[PDB]
Design a protein around this ligand. Structure first.
Ligand SMILES: CC(=O)N[C@H]1[C@H](O[C@H]2[C@@H](O)[C@@H](CO)O[C@@H](O[C@H]3[C@H](O)[C@@H](O)[C@H](O)O[C@@H]3CO)[C@@H]2O)O[C@H](CO)[C@@H](O)[C@@H]1O[C@@H]1O[C@H](CO)[C@H](O)[C@H](O)[C@H]1O
Length: 278
């Protein structure tokens, strides 16, 4: 154990609606120097029964030093498939499971490590559970296949100080660049976030009355082609606090009045797997 707090294990959650292609289940947590193993299961059952089908069973083993995947159905287990466990007892874990129509794609530390073909119906997944030697710190399931170029409005209040836009994406393996625009009602871009792997920098700028501003770079670019990332545009009183994978990558002084940031555009060489306003 460690602390009661959020998601105490054994953790069990009954999905609102079945798990569908395009959706991702994100599980983050902490382990101890004596942690031996923990499991993540996509379960089948009514409400509390359990013990039925397990379309996908994931076992992270610190003793064996492996992450083992399998399926349980019709009262029996199939043949296990293994990958190396990159984690040592202690240090945090970050495992994400994205469903597709023919397989589950599992990433560890945002790096794709396994493609597990469906052995039983994905639609039979009605619950998911986490248990074992792990202290869960974050769980989230959602997203969809976001078409890119992407464009949509932001709530009614939009992105305002005190709020943050969370975007989960993966820069394309052979991508050169992509961008994310936070816009105003008239088309002006309050913030243009533009990673350029060719120039090894992330350009930040504003588009006011059809004109691009100064342009702020400097940072080193913490993004990498083919690796998943968590972008957070934390809107504050005096500036946007741009967080990349949990670390503050940059601050961007507001050039346009905050408030009323009602638009979002995403384009370029990137795959988007999650968008949320928190
Ligand atoms: C407006 C534009 O094209 N911005 C580009 C940026 O272009 C600048 C550079 O090419 C520099 C090199 O010295 O010259 C600048 O123009 C000079 C001009 O040569 C001089 O004759 C004159 O006296 O001064 C001007 C201004 O100093 C160009 O403006 O190049 C960067 C790097 O490739 C581009 O990123 C930038 O395009 C903008 O990038 C943003 C993301 O960082 C957005 O994508 C935005 O939409 C682009 O406009």
């Amino acid at each position: 154990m460690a602390t009661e707090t959020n998601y105490p294990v054994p953790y069990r959650s009954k999905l609102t609606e079945p798990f569908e292609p395009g959706q991702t289940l994100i599980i983050k947590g902490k382990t101890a120097e004596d942690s031996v193993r923990f499991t993540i299961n996509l379960h089948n059952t009514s409400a509390d029964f359990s013990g039925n089908d397990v379309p996908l069973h994931i076992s992270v083993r610190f003793d064996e030093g492996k992450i083992v995947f399998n399926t349980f159905s019709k009262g029996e287990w199939g043949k296990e498939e293994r990958k190396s466990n990159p984690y040592k007892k202690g240090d945090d874990i970050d495992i994400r499971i994205r469903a597709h129509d023919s397989k589950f794609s599992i990433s560890v530390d945002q790096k794709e490590v396994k493609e597990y073909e469906h052995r039983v119906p994905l639609s039979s997944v009605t619950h998911f559970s986490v248990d074992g030697d792990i202290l869960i710190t974050y769980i989230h399931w959602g997203g969809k296949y976001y078409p890119v170029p992407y464009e949509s409005g932001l709530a009614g209040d939009g992105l305002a100080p005190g709020k943050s836009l969370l975007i989960f994406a993966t820069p394309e393996k052979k991508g050169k660049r992509f961008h994310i625009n936070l816009l105003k009602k008239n088309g002006d871009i309050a913030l243009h976030f533009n990673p350029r792997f060719d120039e090894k920098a992330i350009v930040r700028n504003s588009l006011i009355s059809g004109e691009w501003g100064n342009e702020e770079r400097e940072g080193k670019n913490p993004l990498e082609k083919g690796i998943g990332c968590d972008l957070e545009f934390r809107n504050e009183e005096y500036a946007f606090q741009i967080y990349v994978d949990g670390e503050r990558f940059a601050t961007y002084a507001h050039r346009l009045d905050p408030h009323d940031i009602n638009g979002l555009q995403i384009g370029g060489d990137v795959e988007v797997t999650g968008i949320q306003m928190v």
